[PDB]
Design a protein around this ligand. Structure first.
Ligand code: NAG
Ligand code: NAG
Lengths: 39, 22
């Protein structure tokens, strides 16, 4: 039986952050990837 | 008229076509 092979989801990770001396909170962007695949 | 993996990644443009049209 023929099966298709596809590399599983991968991407870059970017950190969105204001200045350190405004706040320490950051957000994370996973490029070209579902939110479901993140964990 | 204009119509046309292994680490390759295509980043989306900051301005979409709709915003450029606007
Ligand atoms: C961080 O922001 C504070 C708030 O005004 C300022 O005093 C300090 O110089 C800032 N530091 C930098 C590197 O911008
Ligand atoms: C995210 O995951 C589900 C299952 O993989 C898929 O059906 C869905 O279309 C994906 N979402 C997007 C926005 O592509």
């Amino acid at each position: 039986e023929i099966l298709d092979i596809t590399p599983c989801s991968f991407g870059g990770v970017s950190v969105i952050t204001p200045g350190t001396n405004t706040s320490n909170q950051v957000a994370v962007l996973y490029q070209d990837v579902n939110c479901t695949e993140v964990p | 008229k204009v119509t046309l993996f292994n680490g390759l990644t295509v980043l989306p443009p900051l301005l979409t076509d709709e915003m450029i049209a606007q």
